[PDB]
């Protein structure tokens, strides 16, 4: 009984931490820019 | 099988990238500092 119980403990904890896995994967996937303004600054000058 | 072995091939590619990034952490220890 102890081993069945702690299996399923691990299973639910893994489900939660995989949902956090997905949260952060999509966070990063959704997630030189300071050069162009200066480029145009010269070009203008 | 094929999917699991895909896990393995992706893990191998990730391991190669891991060695590259380990060198880079041993390598990239400079770039920001030199301009800073």
């Amino acid at each position: 009984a102890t081993y069945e119980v702690q299996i399923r403990q691990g299973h639910d904890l893994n489900e939660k931490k995989q949902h956090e896995v997905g949260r952060l994967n999509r966070e990063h996937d959704k997630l030189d820019m300071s050069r162009g303004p200066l480029e145009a600054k010269r070009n203008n000058l | 099988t094929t999917i699991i072995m895909k896990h393995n091939t992706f893990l191998i590619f990730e391991i190669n990238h891991l060695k590259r990034e380990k060198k880079k952490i041993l390598e990239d220890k400079a770039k920001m500092l030199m301009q800073a």
């Binding site: - | 099988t1 699991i4 072995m5 896990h7 393995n8 893990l11 191998i12 990730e14 391991i15 891991l18 060695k19 990034e21 380990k22 952490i25 041993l26």
Partner: protein, 46 residues
């Protein structure tokens, strides 16, 4: 009926063989993930 039985038993035999191969390929996944773990752990201190 002869062919039916001969195919039915082969079903289970190959089912078990591919079960064992699945177990081994799980082991391979885990070991490659272990090497990745070691690489990132080493980079941790670097």
């Amino acid at each position: 009926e002869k062919l039916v039985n001969m195919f039915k038993k082969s079903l289970q035999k190959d089912n078990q063989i591919h079960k064992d191969d699945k177990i081994r390929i799980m082991k391979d996944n885990v070991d490659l993930i272990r090497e990745i773990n070691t690489l990132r752990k080493s980079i941790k201190d670097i």
